[PDB]
RNA sequence: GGAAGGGCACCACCAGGAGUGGAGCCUGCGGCUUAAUUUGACGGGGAAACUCACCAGGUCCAGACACAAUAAGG
RNA sequence: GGUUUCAAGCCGAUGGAAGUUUGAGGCAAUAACAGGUCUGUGAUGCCCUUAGACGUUCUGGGCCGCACGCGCGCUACACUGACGGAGCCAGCGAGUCUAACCUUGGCCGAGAGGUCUUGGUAAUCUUGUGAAACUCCGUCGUGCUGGGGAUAGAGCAUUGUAAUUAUUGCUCUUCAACGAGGAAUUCCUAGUAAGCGCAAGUCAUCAGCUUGCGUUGAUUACGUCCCUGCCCUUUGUACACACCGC
């Protein structure tokens, strides 16, 4: 449930593109109660995206 | 920055005409495609920040009280003010008072004004500006009064003060000097040229610093009742202030005046 | 003293004689009846009292029945009363007679404003 | 017929898991069938609760008792479609020996035609057991 | 407790008939309390 | 069109009456707190059990048919 | 009898139980409701098909917690009043079966209450519901008082399996803010307001919850659109989108 609780600032996007924001984890198993745009069916994906900063990698000569 | 700037642009797309149609909010923003403008207006309407008036052959967009204060928050993002919003202490008539906090973490007071289409907003704006200028006049004259931070077009953000009203204050030790204070302060009001007719128990706010040094002050919030001395009925207004002080100090503090209190004819040789 | 009675004289009393020294609430509680399962719980309680070393504290027994009158049979046991979430272990004193078990276990966190 | 469906569930477990094939036939045909038809008949939406469904589920452990007691006079008393779906899920979920399933199919194919009987025959054809040739000839 | 159609919302719990105010005005023309004044 | 004119109302005003907001407390909402203070904007939502829709736990019962093994000395 | 093209009609007065449409509410046809489900049917679309509890339980805490804000109510700030006696005035309801309802009466207890019965499935008994406010006579003597009753202590009883964060009732004691109340706010024209209690549903126990009933019974309008709005219209109009400085 702390996964739902401490991550509240990160917005909810549905896989159908519908935005939303969490209220809380309705269950202690991280089953959560959320408010969305519209009447979703049970088939879409409630999702978040988190980003790691990537960095370039070195190079070397190659004599055949 | 950018979305707040375009929301400021459609804020500036309000001081052009009356109830604004759809393509003016398309073009005053000057954005790229149908996407940004239409999905922004839908985000406004679903959060009740805008409303649709469809008067025959004519779409139009009706701004309610909701989708303004963000811009004021943006206006207060400019002026170093509040970051966190909401704690209800007092729902008044011409304002709703909230306890808020800045980025710095000090709690402040957010009086939103709700006094539609232009006139509710604009009269809340005139009320906030008028009260801010009256607060400026009181602090410029030197009256002990809360210090104003800003007047975000129609929402006044000011300081919080540790005080409690006099109805729950039994007494103090220096009662006759408190009577001389609450006589001489109405004398100072008449020397300002004004009379605050609602000089009641709920008005006067006392901050309490210590019990040894006795370095404290007062807070007087009577803004839609201050009346200039030139008006028709200021005599018994002044006398109601004086006599409410005296009847409270007789009823609560059990104090009768040994010096005679000032009259209006006494204070006519003042300012 | 519970009614001006010495402690060890109180200790060997039955439940019904303690009802004979009880207030009206305890008397009318016991006069209507009691469940069969706290009898086996008291047998477990006295077995854990028989699992006590000399000159020390007995085995703590955890309890849910918060509405039970502390009868002088249970004086001296270390009892973990359940508050709805957790168990709190208190030694039963002769100062605790006539009370419910629910009176000795706080069921919620305090509310801090100022 | 004035019990609760929990009580009918527990009494069906008791009186099928202990009583014999003819005795639980009489139990289900007298006590479960009339309470069954009065729960569904006297209601305005003509459906059934979940614990009578569990009772009819637990009544199939002796299959002689189940088919000779529950299913066979019910279709002759008027079977509707909620009884079909509920007792067909009963007939599907519990593993039944093939002989009494075969006698049940031989019963249900002979009946006056009804889509409830079609649901029950459809459930008995979801088994694909080792049927005797008389049950195949009834098909 | 609604013992007819599981309709606890607005029971009329008086006299044990126990019909919700939605379905009570469905079955209002079966008992006899009808509109006079 | 931000022209003016009528209704016609004690959810408007005048004649008033009882008042609320003043004290204490009951009770509904918001806020805070929590492990939960279940959830709506009176919800027949009167209230220890139930109702309970919320927490701390402890548990049953799942899953049909097909299909490879496994057999009545098990 | 005024008023009205002296027309459909309005107003003042008389007779009338009733003379403002004697007053209120239900009823259609036409033109809006995705308004709220049916535990609906359809090789319907689609995440899994179940180790999920969605189903079940069983305990104990909650839903009541508190610097505060928004609001409605109860009780007061007393002498047109509190206490102590006496008189004892209604009406709407409501009541038990294959159960424990309404209870009369008699004894015990300071009471709470308890005991023993009896009547009533009801215009019959509870019931004449001998309610409260009210009437009279004494105590008080304006003094946060003999107004207030918040808070707290002690025990005793009742319903409930379980009364602890006390369900509630009874006895004694502890006697707080509160000296007619601000900015502002609500409702209202005759048995209406206001004061009062009672009965019925919430009712296992209690109301400060809702509804009907009856007792006592004012002031003052019977005018207005001046505020608050709500409409109804009349039409000056779209600059039919113009210039700019920006």
Swiss-Prot record, chain A:
Function: Required for 40S ribosomal subunit synthesis. Required for normal export of the pre-40S particles from the nucleus to the cytoplasm. Its subcellular location and association with pre-40S subunitshifts from mixed cytoplasm/nucleus to all nuclear in RPS19 disruptions, suggesting it acts after the ribosomal protein.
Taxonomic lineage of the native organism: Eukaryota, Fungi, Dikarya, Ascomycota, Saccharomycotina
Residue numbers of the full-length protein present here: 724 to 787 of 788
Protein name according to UniProt: Ribosome biogenesis protein TSR1
Domain of life: Eukaryota
Family according to the record: Belongs to the TRAFAC class translation factor GTPase superfamily. Bms1-like GTPase family. TSR1 subfamily.
Subcellular location: Cytoplasm; Nucleus, Nucleolus
Record's subunit section: Interacts with RIO2.
Other notes: Present with 1390 molecules/cell in log phase SD medium.
UniProtKB/Swiss-Prot annotation, chain B:
EC number: 2.7.11.1
GO CC annotations, alphabetized: cytoplasm; cytoplasmic stress granule; cytosol; nucleus; preribosome, small subunit precursor
Consequence when changing residue 93 to I: No change in activity
Required co-factors: Mg(2+)
Substitution effect: residue 155 to V: In RIO2-1; nuclear export of ribosomal 40S subunits impaired
Name of the top EC class for this enzyme: transferase
Reaction(s) this enzyme catalyzes, per UniProt: L-seryl-[protein] + ATP = O-phospho-L-seryl-[protein] + ADP + H(+); L-threonyl-[protein] + ATP = O-phospho-L-threonyl-[protein] + ADP + H(+)
Subcellular location: Cytoplasm; Nucleus
Binding sites annotated in the UniProt record for ATP: 111
Residues in Protein kinase domain copies: 83-226
A GO biological-process term: maturation of SSU-rRNA from tricistronic rRNA transcript (SSU-rRNA, 5.8S rRNA, LSU-rRNA)
Enzyme active site: 198
Protein keywords: ATP-binding, Cytoplasm, Kinase, Magnesium, Metal-binding, Nucleotide-binding, Nucleus, Phosphoprotein, Ribosome biogenesis, Serine/threonine-protein kinase, Transferase
Family membership noted in the UniProt record: Belongs to the protein kinase superfamily. RIO-type Ser/Thr kinase family.
Note from the entry: Present with 10300 molecules/cell in log phase SD medium.
Record note on quaternary structure: Component of a late pre-40S ribosomal particle, composed of the 40S ribosomal proteins and the non-ribosomal factors DIM1, DIM2, ENP1, HRR25, LTV1, NOB1, RIO2 and TSR1.
Protein's name in the database: Serine/threonine-protein kinase RIO2
Organism: Saccharomyces cerevisiae (strain ATCC 204508 / S288c) (Baker's yeast)
Name of the encoding gene: RIO2
Curated annotation (Swiss-Prot), chain C:
Superkingdom, taxonomy of origin: Eukaryota
Location (main, coarse): cytoplasm
Isomerase is among the record's keywords: no
Glycyl lysine isopeptide (Lys-Gly) (interchain with G-Cter in ubiquitin) cross-link site: 9, 20, 49
Keywords of this entry: Acetylation, Cytoplasm, Isopeptide bond, Ribonucleoprotein, Ribosomal protein, Ribosome biogenesis, Ubl conjugation
Cell location: Cytoplasm
Keyword Protein biosynthesis recorded: no
Gene Ontology biological process terms from the UniProt entry: cytoplasmic translation; ribosomal small subunit assembly; ribosomal subunit export from nucleus
Subunit structure: Component of the small ribosomal subunit (SSU). Mature yeast ribosomes consist of a small (40S) and a large (60S) subunit. The 40S small subunit contains 1 molecule of ribosomal RNA (18S rRNA) and 33 different proteins (encoded by 57 genes). The large 60S subunit contains 3 rRNA molecules (25S, 5.8S and 5S rRNA) and 46 different proteins (encoded by 81 genes).
Function: Component of the ribosome, a large ribonucleoprotein complex responsible for the synthesis of proteins in the cell. The small ribosomal subunit (SSU) binds messenger RNAs (mRNAs) and translates the encoded message by selecting cognate aminoacyl-transfer RNA (tRNA) molecules. The large subunit (LSU) contains the ribosomal catalytic site termed the peptidyl transferase center (PTC), which catalyzes the formation of peptide bonds, thereby polymerizing the amino acids delivered by tRNAs into a polypeptide chain.
Record protein name field: Small ribosomal subunit protein uS19
Phylogenetic placement of the source organism: Eukaryota, Fungi, Dikarya, Ascomycota, Saccharomycotina
Protein's gene: RPS15
Residues of the full protein shown: 16 to 129 of 142
Curated annotation (Swiss-Prot), chain D:
Coiled-coil regions listed in the entry: none
Protein's cellular compartments: Cytoplasm; Nucleus, Nucleolus
Function per UniProt: Required for normal export of the pre-40S particles from the nucleus to the cytoplasm. Its subcellular location and association with pre-40S subunit shifts from mixed cytoplasm/nucleus to all nuclear in RPS19 disruptions, suggesting it acts after the ribosomal protein.
Additional note from the record: Present with 21600 molecules/cell in log phase SD medium.
Family: Belongs to the bystin family.
The protein's name in its UniProt record: Essential nuclear protein 1
Gene it is expressed from: ENP1
């Amino acid at each position: 449930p702390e996964d739902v609780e401490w991550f509240k600032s990160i917005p909810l996007f549905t896989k159908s593109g519908r935005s939303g924001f969490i209220k809380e984890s309705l269950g202690t198993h991280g089953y959560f109660k959320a408010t969305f745009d519209g009447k979703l069916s049970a088939q879409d994906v409630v999702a978040m995206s988190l980003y790691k900063r990537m960095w370039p990698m070195p190079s070397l000569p190659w004599n055949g | 920055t950018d979305d707040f700037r375009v929301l400021q642009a459609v804020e500036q797309g309000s001081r052009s005409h009356e109830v604004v149609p759809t393509p003016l909010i398309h073009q005053i923003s000057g954005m790229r495609s149908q996407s940004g403008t239409n999905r922004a207006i839908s985000d406004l309407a679903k959060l009740s920040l805008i409303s649709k008036m469809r008067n025959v052959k004519y779409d139009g967009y009706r701004l309610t009280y909701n989708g303004i204060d963000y811009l004021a928050l943006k206006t207060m993002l400019n002026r170093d003010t509040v970051y966190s919003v909401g704690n209800t202490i007092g729902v008044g008539k011409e304002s709703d008072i909230y306890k808020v906090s800045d980025k710095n973490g000090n709690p402040r007071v957010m009086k939103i004004h709700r006094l539609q289409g232009a006139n509710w907003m604009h009269l809340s704006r005139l009320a906030a500006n008028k009260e801010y200028q009256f607060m400026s006049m009181l602090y410029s004259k030197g009256f002990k009064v809360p210090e104003p931070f800003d007047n975000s077009r129609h929402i006044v953000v000011m300081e919080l003060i540790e005080g409690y009203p006099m109805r729950r204050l039994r007494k103090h030790k220096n009662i006759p000097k408190l009577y001389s204070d609450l006589m001489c302060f109405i004398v100072d009001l008449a020397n300002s040229g004004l009379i605050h007719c609602d000089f009641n128990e709920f008005n006067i706010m006392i901050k309490d610093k210590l019990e040894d040094e006795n370095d404290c002050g007062f807070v007087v919030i009577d803004f839609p009742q201050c009346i200039s001395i030139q008006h028709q009925d200021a005599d018994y207004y002044f006398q109601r202030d004086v006599d409410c002080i005296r009847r409270f100090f007789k009823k609560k503090l059990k104090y009768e005046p040994k010096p005679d209190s000032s009259m209006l004819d006494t204070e006519g040789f003042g300012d | 003293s519970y009614r001006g009675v010495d402690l060890e004289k109180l200790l060997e009393m039955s439940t019904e004689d303690f009802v004979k020294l009880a207030p009206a609430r305890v008397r009318r509680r016991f006069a209507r009846g009691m469940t069969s399962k706290p009898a086996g719980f008291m047998k477990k309680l006295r077995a854990a009292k028989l699992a006590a070393p000399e000159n020390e504290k007995p085995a703590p027994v955890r309890t849910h029945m918060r509405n039970m009158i502390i009868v002088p049979e249970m004086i001296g046991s270390v009892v973990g009363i359940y508050n709805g979430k957790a168990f709190n272990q208190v030694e039963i004193r002769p100062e605790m007679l006539g009370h419910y078990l629910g009176e000795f276990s706080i069921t919620y966190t305090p509310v801090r404003h100022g | 017929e004035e019990w609760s469906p929990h009580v009918v569930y527990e009494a069906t477990k008791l009186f099928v898991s202990n009583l014999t094939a003819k005795e639980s036939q009489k139990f289900i045909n007298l006590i479960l069938l009339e309470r069954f038809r009065d729960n569904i008949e006297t209601s305005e939406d003509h459906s059934l609760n979940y614990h009578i469904y569990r009772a009819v589920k637990k009544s199939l452990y002796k299959p002689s008792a189940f088919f000779k007691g529950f299913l066979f006079p019910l279709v002759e008393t008027g079977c509707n479609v909620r009884e079909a779906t509920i007792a067909g899920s009963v007939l599907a979920k519990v593993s039944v020996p093939a002989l009494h399933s075969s006698a049940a199919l031989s019963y249900l194919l002979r009946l006056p035609f009804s889509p409830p009987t079609t649901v029950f025959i459809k459930i008995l054809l979801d088994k694909k057991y080792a049927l005797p040739y008389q049950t195949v000839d009834d098909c | 407790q609604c013992r007819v159609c599981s309709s606890h919302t607005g029971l009329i719990r008086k006299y044990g008939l126990n019909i919700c105010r939605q379905c009570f005005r469905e079955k209002a023309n079966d008992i006899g309390f009808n509109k006079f004044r």
